[PDB]
Design a protein around this ligand. Structure first.
Ligand SMILES: [Cl-]
Ligand SMILES: [Cl-]
Ligand SMILES: [Cl-]
Lengths: 328, 327
């Protein structure tokens, strides 16, 4: 009786949201990258389910939450490992090959990229524009691997992969460089939480923009088994800190998340860049010695600001509230 | 495109439903409870001739009960008048509450899935004096040994939300009480054997109110294979007019739709009574006994008035447009 999926909650409002997104894209004449004027500043949060009763939560969780990927990322200690910060939850995402965009769109707007607006914007940048600095940063990162098994064509195909052409799934899968291009279209950092953190895990900064022109709260995604999902903040979950840690525990120490595609001079000042493009806070967490506390960096996460008029989750919630009363 | 109408805006459906029980007025002097404002709303369906057949097909599988539409048209019971706007049958859940689902959709574009209408029928039957309803029903029953009290008790029991199909099926007297709860006539177009070779079909008037206190456009339902659906008017330009005939063809003559549960004096002045509660017009039709045309009575049907704010069909339409432009 609930909606089997989120979008089913108000199919009309979804269409409207989607229809607003192309119009918010500004397309510079002079080669500066096309970018969103306003909508990149939106953030969705998930509503609390604990005040409901078990058979009801199940309905909701089955309907909304990717429980397989949540359990995977949690058991490998990459997701929600830190007791001090608010819980993040994975939302179901279509796994058609366009899931990088479906998850990113959902994180901001509560809809997936089914009209291909984000997908087309990515391809657009990598074909209609020249992309010299992108290719360079990609070469630099590729050559960091201590070994090369014996690449003239590799860049051209990466551009082809971003196309909406059919490959296997409906769309070609995307890779790290596409995430970095995407964060520059959004003027917003993307942080990807995964097991290897094919190395998609880590931090993507909109370096083709001065931080002054960017939104300083990240989009947070989860990645496992070739699949992206958004990892959204669970609402009213104080007193825990609204932030995502910029390190993980690894073999008894804290290890920094990878920052992708930096030049040598940028890499030398990685901490300074992180502090410009995110809101970095230094928080205490328990040590391996129960008698020690450690300070680590974390980045503030945004508060829910997606208005009702364009929020499928609020409508989902009222559906839930109307239904719960019938169950009580 | 969504597979059913309500999947088009689940949030709005709930809003609509949440308004209904608050619109009911419960009197303390014994007068039946009834709707204050929402009984006046009427839904119209949008046209799909502006689309290509493959698309038409998807809209029609989603919205239209084509089985019942085809059955009633093939008997010349539905859409047989050349002068008049087409009516279309919408899909309705067949769970034993379909009388209420179809009535609710006709006015409000949502089904009775909170049981508001069903509960209001059972409430009137169980918790007020129903002496007049019973008397009228006895007269219709008589027009083997009968036990009136046992049978009346059973009809009240059928109205409940008790599982017996998820719910008990309802019959004529329930439609009669319902139209008095809505203060609005209900006209049922039903499947019926050819006279040459049923009883639910006909006109139910809110005779427990003066006509001046009732809405004077009817609710129109179809009935076949024990199932009710709303028959809503199709939006259109001119020149054809919005109406529903009040008689059926019967070979070379016409047969008046049954007017249910009348007392004998009322039945004597039936045409007068129909003109009080409905807007009765005369429409010329081609004759089947000799004679180019004959005038038959028909009732005017309402224009669409269900504001967008509470219209799932508008939202459905806007989805059709978006999804269409893409192809
Ligand atoms: Cl911790
Ligand atoms: Cl450890
Ligand atoms: Cl320690």
């Amino acid at each position: 009786v609930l909606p089997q999926a989120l979008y089913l909650s108000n199919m009309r409002k979804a269409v409207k949201i989607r229809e607003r997104t192309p119009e918010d894209i500004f397309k510079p004449t002079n080669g500066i990258i096309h970018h969103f004027k306003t909508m990149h500043r939106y953030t969705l949060e998930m509503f609390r389910t604990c005040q409901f009763c078990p058979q009801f939560r199940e309905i909701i969780h089955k309907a909304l939450i990717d429980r397989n990927i949540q359990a995977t990322l949690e058991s490998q200690k990459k997701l929600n490992w830190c007791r001090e910060v608010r819980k993040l939850v994975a939302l179901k995402t279509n796994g058609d090959g366009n899931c990088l965009m479906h998850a990113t769109s959902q994180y901001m707007w509560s809809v997936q990229d089914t009209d291909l607006v984000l997908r087309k914007a990515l391809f657009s940048t990598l074909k209609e524009t020249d992309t010299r600095n992108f290719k360079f940063r990609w070469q630099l990162e590729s050559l960091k691997s201590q070994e090369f098994v014996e690449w003239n064509d590799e860049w051209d195909n990466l551009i082809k992969m971003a196309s909406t052409d059919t490959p296997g799934l409906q769309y070609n899968s995307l890779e790290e460089i596409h995430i970095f291009v995407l964060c520059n279209i959004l003027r917003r950092p993307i942080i990807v939480i995964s097991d290897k953190m094919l190395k998609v895990g880590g931090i993507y900064l909109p370096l083709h923009w001065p931080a002054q022109e960017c939104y300083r709260y990240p989009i947070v995604l989860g990645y496992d088994s070739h699949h992206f999902v958004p990892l959204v903040t669970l609402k009213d979950s104080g007193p825990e800190i609204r932030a995502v840690p910029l390190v993980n525990r690894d073999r008894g120490r804290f290890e920094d998340l990878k920052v992708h595609f930096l030049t040598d001079p940028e890499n030398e000042m990685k901490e300074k860049l992180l502090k410009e493009y995110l809101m970095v806070i230094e928080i205490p967490v328990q040590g391996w010695d129960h008698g020690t506390t450690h300070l680590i960096n974390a980045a503030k996460l945004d508060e829910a600001n997606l208005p009702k008029e364009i929020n499928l989750v609020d409508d989902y919630f009222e559906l839930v509230q109307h239904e719960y009363k019938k169950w009580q």
